[PDB]
Each structure stands twice: as C-alpha cells, then as structure tokens.
Amino acid sequence: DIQVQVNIDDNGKNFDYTYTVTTESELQKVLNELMDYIKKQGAKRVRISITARSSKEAYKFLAILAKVFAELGYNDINRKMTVRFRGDDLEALEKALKEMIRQARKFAGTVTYTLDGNDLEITITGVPRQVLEELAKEAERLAKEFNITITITVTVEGQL
C-alpha cells in the first residue's frame, strides 16, 4: 500500500531501513520508532522517501515528513519529488513528460527524467513544499487525462 525508504549516514554507521506499511496507522509507528532513535544516538544525515498513489496522498506525506524533520530540529532541509508514470501508449507518456517538465520549470524547478520502455520517471528539485504540492495535482490530472498509471514519491533529506 505505501513504500518507505529511510537512510541514516554517519561515516562508520549507515542504515537502509525499508518498509511497506499497508494501513498507514503503521506508518506513524515506524516514523515514531526512528525519531526516538535519533533523539538518542543522533544522526548526521537523514533522508526519507514515502511513496504514494494520489495527489492527495502526496500532500499528506510531505506534511507528515515536514513534521518529522521539524520535530527533529533539522532546518537544513532538502525536498524532492519523483513522479512515476506507467502506460503502454508511449505517445501519451511523452505528451505527459513535456507538460510535466514545463510546469516544473514554470517555477525555479530542476528536473531529470528517464524513459525506459513504458516507464517514465521524472525527478524534481529546488522547490518549496508549496510548489511540490501544486506540481502533484498536475501530476495527477495528467495521469487521469491519458489514463496512465502514476506514482509520487516524496523524498526529503536533511543534514544537521
């Protein structure tokens, strides 16, 4: 139902906790576990993605994420979202890519994208939470339009 990768790097200590929480009641638990950990041991660098399937879900998740890093006292924050489109007609896939990169760049946004046979990935950097959210509605209406599969991972790394 919902993917979670998490990375702590410390030089000498590293960790790649990787989850699938299905309820998302779960999700708060595991987020919570992690935090009690860093309050203790204290990490140098953390990164956390949470994968979604809906524009609405995307909203929840960076918010949830924001709360986390915020509680963590991590102000040197670094966002990112990687939209994933899936569909057989490679035409409409591209049509989406164009339109998607457009809007990402209508703001100060830097994209990378890869298309590897009917799977098109589009990463997106250098924007506020406010943009990402608005860029994800756009991701979702695009999916709906040409009836392609969408996914929206919401990364957010941060050091301190």
Complete DSSP assignment for the chain:
-EEEEEEEE-SS-EE--EEEESSSHHHHHHHHHHHHHHHHT--SEEEEEEEESSHHHHHHHHHHHHHHHHHTT--EEEEEEEEEEE-S-HHHHHHHHHHHHHHHHTTT-EEEEEE-SSEEEEEEES--HHHHHHHHHHHHHHHHHHT-EEEEEEEEEEE-
Nearest to 129 by CA among 67, 75, 70, 63: 63
Question: How many independent structural domains does the chain possess?
Answer: 1
Experimental method: X-ray
Residue-number span of the structural domain to which 135 is assigned: 1-160
CATH value at residue 58: 3.30.70.600
